[PDB]
Specification:
The complex is a heterodimer of chains A (14) and B (260). With 14 residues, chain A is low in regular secondary structure. Helices cover 0% and strands 0% of the residues of chain A. Helices cover 7% and strands 33% of the residues of chain B. Classes of the chains: A little secondary structure (14), B mainly beta (260). The complex binds a molecule of 5 linked components (NAG-NAG-BMA-MAN-FUL) and P-amino benzamidine (2 copies). Chain B: It catalyses: Preferential cleavage: Arg-|-Xaa, Lys-|-Xaa.
């Protein structure tokens, strides 16, 4: 379920 | 992509590299792009499957910045490689007009999201066709020059302006070949544009204005690449939300649409 959450977000690393 | 720039690692975590797998020697070649919707599904172009129609013809590569042409090695953490479970081509897809150039790939086993991998957003049911004027972005590992010999090892990105369908469809532009389920994007003079290898990848515009991008288009076709008055023609995602929901479930759609 890691792929649920806020869509379309870039640079998830920061 | 012609005339754009190298993307930063993690810049577009929904990008997927769709690679033909030549089974005689286990080598893989980037062929098309796609966008990640959830752990088990990505959105891409139907025409990418005209020749390789079998689930075994492909590898799917996630969280990548660079892809290696012809490699026979698997990828390295944190990149992920997956098999295709199913290819769903729109039932109304027509290669001669490129009408309804859209498909879904079911991924297996499920991808896991994180720092370099994550879902894109789809337009709201209420959004309608995207409106001009806007500056949007495309990304992909397509050709760097119209005449290139190979796709680009480094993921590219470029800003492109949306082009109004009437202008795009006009006499000295595509002159009748644009459909109402298309979006066009680029610049009257060209020089910047998607090319072969970027098909299936996103055309994305920044909501208005969360800090989240929406995949409003899917790279479909063009005449050449980066030519004046021959911009990129994309499939409008908004036009197929019901279709997408019918294959993956309204719930999965709602999950990647930004809050009402
Ligand atoms: C882009 O332009 C094209 C064509 O206009 C071009 O002419 C071409 C050949 C070039 O020379 C250029 O000059 C110019 O760009 C538009 O193409 C037309 O599309 C129409 C809409 O699909 C269509 O009319 C046909 O007739 C039938 C429609 O009938 C159904 O629909 C309704 C009315 O909408 C009812 O009235 C009907 O009884 C029935 O329900 C359809 O079956 C056909 O699909 C078609 O719609 C023509 O197909 C087509 N004409 C030509 C000359 O090709 C195109 O729509 C423009 N794109 C956009 C987004 O506007
Ligand atoms: N989808 C899978 N069952 C699968 C797909 C391709 C493949 N080579 C092996 C397994
Ligand atoms: N942007 C276009 N010129 C284009 C897009 C896709 C493609 N396969 C070829 C050309």
């Amino acid at each position: 379920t890691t792929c649920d959450g806020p869509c379309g977000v870039r640079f998830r690393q920061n | 992509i012609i005339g754009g720039q190298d993307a930063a690692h993690g810049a577009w975590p929904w990008m997927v590299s769709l690679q033909i797998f030549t089974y005689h020697n286990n080598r893989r070649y980037h062929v098309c792009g796609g966008s990640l919707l959830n752990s088990q599904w990505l959105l891409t172009a139907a025409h990418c499957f005209r020749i390789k129609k079998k689930v075994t013809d492909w590898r799917l590569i996630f969280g990548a910045k660079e892809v290696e042409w012809g490699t026979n090695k698997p990828v390295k953490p944190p990149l992920q490689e997956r098999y295709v479970e199913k290819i769903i081509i729109h039932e109304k897809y027509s290669a001669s007009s490129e009408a309804n150039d859209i498909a879904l790939m079911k991924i297996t086993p499920p991808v896991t999201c994180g720092h370099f991998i994550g879902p894109g957003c789809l337009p709201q049911f209420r959004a309608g066709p995207p409106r001009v004027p806007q500056t949007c972005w495309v990304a992909g590992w397509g050709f760097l020059q119209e005449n290139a010999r190979r796709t680009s090892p480094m993921l590219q990105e470029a800003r492109v302006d949306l082009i109004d369908l009437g202008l795009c469809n006009s006499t000295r532009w595509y002159n009748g070949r644009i459909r109402s389920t298309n979006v066009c994007a680029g610049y009257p003079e060209g020089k910047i544009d998607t090319c072969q290898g970027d098909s299936g990848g996103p055309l994305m515009c920044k909501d208005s204005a969360e800090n989240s991008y929406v995949v409003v288009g899917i790279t479909s076709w063009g005449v050449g690449c980066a030519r004046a008055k021959r911009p990129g023609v994309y499939t409008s995602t908004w036009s197929y939300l019901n279709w997408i929901a019918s294959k993956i479930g309204s719930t999965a759609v709602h999950m990647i649409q930004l809050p009402t």
